């Protein structure tokens, strides 16, 4: 019983990959421009100097 009480939450925070979920949320937002950045082969603008 003590092992279950101290192991359910242990396996919960132990089996967690929320970083990929955050990346997936950002993908849901603008994936066609962020993940699929295959439109231009090189940029064309100025820099800072």
């Amino acid at each position: 019983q003590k092992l279950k009480q101290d192991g359910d939450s242990f396996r919960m925070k132990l089996n967690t990959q929320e970083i990929f979920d955050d990346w997936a949320r950002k993908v849901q937002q603008r994936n066609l421009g962020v993940s699929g950045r295959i439109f231009t082969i090189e940029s064309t603008r100025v820099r800072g100097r």
Binding site: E42, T44, R45
Partner: peptide
């Protein structure tokens, strides 16, 4: 440099 940026972003504003 500046000339390269102008030759590249001329059509890309």
């Amino acid at each position: 440099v500046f000339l390269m940026k102008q030759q590249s972003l001329l059509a890309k504003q």
